[PDB]
Amino acid sequence: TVVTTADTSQLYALAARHGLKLHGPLTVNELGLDYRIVIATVDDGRRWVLRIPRRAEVSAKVEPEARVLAMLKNRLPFAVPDWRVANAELVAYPMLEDSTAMVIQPGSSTPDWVVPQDSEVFAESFATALAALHAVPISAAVDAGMLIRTPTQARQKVADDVDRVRREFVVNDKRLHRWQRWLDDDSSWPDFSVVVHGDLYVGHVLIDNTERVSGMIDWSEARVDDPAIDMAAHLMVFGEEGLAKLLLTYEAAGGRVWPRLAHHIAERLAFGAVTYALFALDSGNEEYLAAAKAQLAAAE
């Protein structure tokens, strides 16, 4: 006998309760704070992703996300997870076998690989894919019960997040002033909202062998909100040059822009410190909290 991390008997029983018969290789990621993620082979010869909520508060999020994905399926020219099982104890979908646009070993802080800066096919297809997502009608989001933020509500959410961090943490004065100046800078903020992915970066984008965007995964943060939310990570990973190329093609593909969009994206990226700190706080994880506190106290 050999000790293995996966509990095959419990996983089999769980899947079988939802009409899936596990048979063959599987792999387990337990590093998620909210879900256990298993990639398992099923008797259809196919690999499936089992997204297993850990606790009642996580399970509560399954039904609304399922409605989002069901709405998005026909309205995007790329693949999203097809949640053929979606309930409080299990989400399961056939694996989208195309690679993520970055590869990282679980637990590692350094990727093995990220789609290259000079991949024009990736850059271009990510820009058009993003324009397509942001073109999903608001009416479809409303009909699917999505979280909707008007421009005023979008700005209020950012203000609320900043204020929550200010209450719970001690923040570098210049950082605080940056965020406040941003919140007060009317010209930075868009006069419309769009359907956003909400957690979009190379690790949640799938690409085919040619590096063309073919899918997006991990839609739990999707909502109607500020478009720049989905562009901050592109600026981090690909720099100002990558951002410039993105904005030209996004606009050419029909994406709605505004004159200070590039500036706003950079402020959104800086606001990632707030997002991280609140994630750390809500996680209860002391290592994440240690990192957040150190970042917040530090000068940018």
Ligand X SMILES: Nc1nc2c(ncn2[C@@H]2O[C@H](CO)[C@@H](O)[C@H]2O)c(=O)[nH]1
Ligand Y SMILES: CC[C@H]1OC(=O)[C@H](C)[C@@H](O[C@H]2C[C@@](C)(OC)[C@@H](O)[C@H](C)O2)[C@H](C)[C@@H](O[C@@H]2O[C@H](C)C[C@H](N(C)C)[C@H]2O)[C@](C)(O)C[C@@H](C)C(=O)[C@H](C)[C@@H](O)[C@]1(C)O
Q: Can you give the binding site for ligand Y, defined by CB under 6 A?
A: 102, 104, 109, 111, 199-201, 203, 221, 232-233, 236-237, 272, 275-276, 279
What count of other Cβ atoms lies within 10 Å of the Cβ of residue 70? 14
Residue span binding ligand X (CB under 6 A) among the ranges 112-120, 132-140, 201-209, 229-237 = 201-209
Q: Which stretch binds ligand X (CB under 6 A): 20-28, 84-92, 96-104, 127-135?
A: 96-104
Number of residues that bind ligand X (CB under 6 A): 13
| Number of residue whose CB is nearest ligand X | 96
> Quick check: is 82 catalytic?
no
Q: What minimum distance in Å lies between the beta carbon of 280 and ligand Y?
A: 8
Closest approach, Cβ 93 to ligand X, in A, equals 7
Residue closer to ligand Y (CB basis): 86 or 101: 101
- Which C-beta is closer to ligand Y: that of 15 or that of 126? 126
Task: Pick the closest to residue 281 from 162, 107, 164, 173 (CA basis).
Answer: 164
Q: Does 90 bind ligand X (CB under 6 A)?
A: no
Please choose, out of 91-99, 154-162, 224-232, 282-290, the segment that lies near ligand X by the rule CB under 6 A: 91-99
State the binding partner of 217 from ligand X, ligand Y, none, CB within 5 to 8 A by kind.
Answer: ligand X
Q: Does 214 interact with ligand X (rule: CB under 6 A)?
A: no
Contacts of residue 95, Cβ cutoff 8 Å, sequence gap at least 6: 39, 46, 47, 48, 49
Query: Does 98 count as an annotated binding residue?
Result: yes
Interaction between residue 135 and ligand X (CB under 6 A): no
Give the C-alpha separation, 37 to 70, whole Å: 21
**Order of strands across the sheet that contains 213-216:** 99-100, 205-207, 213-216
Contact of residue 148 among ligand Y, ligand X, none (CB under 5-8 Å per partner type): none
- 235 assigned to a ligand binding site: no
Q: Which is nearer to ligand Y, 188 or 275 (CB)?
A: 275
Q: What is the residue type of 186?
A: D
Catalytic residue among 44, 199, 208, 230: 199
CB contact set of 255 (below 8 Å; sequence gap of 6+) = 127, 130, 131, 134, 135, 227
Between 150 and 210, whose beta carbon lies closer to ligand X? 210
List residues near ligand X by CB under 6 A.
37, 49, 81, 95-96, 98-100, 203-204, 206, 217-218
Name the binding residues for GDP: 51, 93, 96, 98
Active site residues: 199
